[PDB]
Amino acid sequence: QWALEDFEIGRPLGKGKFGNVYLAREKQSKFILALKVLFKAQLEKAGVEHQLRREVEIQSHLRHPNILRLYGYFHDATRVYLILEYAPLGTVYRELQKLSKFDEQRTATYITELANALSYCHSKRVIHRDIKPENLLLGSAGELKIADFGWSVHAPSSRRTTLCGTLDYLPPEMIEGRMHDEKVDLWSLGVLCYEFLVGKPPFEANTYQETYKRISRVEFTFPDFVTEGARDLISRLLKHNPSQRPMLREVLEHPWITANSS
Ligand SMILES: Nc1ncnc2c1ncn2[C@@H]1O[C@H](COP(=O)(O)OP(=O)(O)OP(=O)(O)O)[C@@H](O)[C@H]1O
Ligand SMILES: Cc1c(C(=O)O)cc(-c2ccc(Cl)c(C#N)c2)c2cc[nH]c12
Ligand SMILES: [Mg+2]
């Protein structure tokens, strides 16, 4: 049972919609970690308390090199604090902003690390559902770490998340209230893969409705520089029908992955 007096807070690490994340030192052992701070009032106005509950419950029972550890939590009059493993190198979102695109070596390596973590998740029947770049964090060795388990759940599910926030990373089954499973994250791995090579996710549009349309009709094209190996993998992962999508096994053995990862 920890409290806020047990920590020294440093600078801010990020803003999510709900999370205000700060760097922290536990006073006792001098351990460096990150505190995700949530305001009771905004959770309660948005009615996302259940999401928090799932995040805490699911994320604490998971142990994997590529998954952000949740160490503990506690709360006070106005706030809830989650105690998290600190990720020194930022987010992939930021990496991507700095580089525009990633080469195949980097892309394929991130896809591997993702596939591993997902794999471990899925083996526990857990699905992330919110696998955007801003929730992919880098550890000290530049290894990728999955985070923000507020939208995670056990499979299968019907439950809506975002009323309409970013659809960019969501498969059709999801953007349409249908029962969906493990295959959801397979679709997102595809968006990510493509985004990583191109610098834009494949269904981006000026409006929500147009993106929605692009997504459900699976409308995307590749620019010229994208290699057949990549075209191939992205095409297998971005299938309308969830069950036509690869297994995590197949992705890792994919000739383009093995040719390019580390
Ligand atoms: N452990 C961490 N180490 C370093 N930076 C972090 C960490 N956690 C979060 N950040 C930074 O803060 C941002 C917001 O955090 P997070 O994604 O957990 O919040 P959220 O998006 O509000 O969560 P949720 O969708 O569950 O409500 C991250 O995208 C990243 O910029
Ligand atoms: C009113 C209130 C209380 C309470 O006073 O009892 C507690 C919480 C809450 C929710 C999740 C976690 Cl994990 C923790 C912790 N630790 C605390 C919340 C959330 C919105 N309102 C709340
Ligand atoms: Mg986030």
Question: Can you put this structure into words, describing what you see?
Answer:
The chain is α+β, with helices and mostly antiparallel strands. The protein folds into two domains: 2-90, Phosphorylase Kinase, domain 1, CATH 3.30.200; 91-261, Transferase(Phosphotransferase), domain 1, CATH 1.10.510.10. It has ten helices and nine strands. It has helices spanning 40-46, 49-60, 92-99, 104-123, 172-175, 183-198, 208-216, 228-237, 248-252, 255-260, and strands at residues 7-15, 20-26, 32-39, 70-75, 79-84, 126-127, 136-138, 144-146, 153-154. The chain has a five-stranded antiparallel β-sheet with strand order 1-2-3-5-4. α4 runs antiparallel to α6. The protein starts with 6 loop residues before the first strand and ends with a helix. The site of ligand T0X has 10 residues, from α1, α2 and β4. Residues 16, 134-135, 148 line the site of magnesium ion (MG). This is Aurora kinase A. One of its GO terms (molecular function) is ubiquitin protein ligase binding. It catalyses: L-seryl-[protein] + ATP = O-phospho-L-seryl-[protein] + ADP + H(+); L-threonyl-[protein] + ATP = O-phospho-L-threonyl-[protein] + ADP + H(+). The modification Phosphothreonine is found at residues 161-162. Its main location: cytoplasm.
Summarize the structure.
Helix content is 37%, strand content 18%.
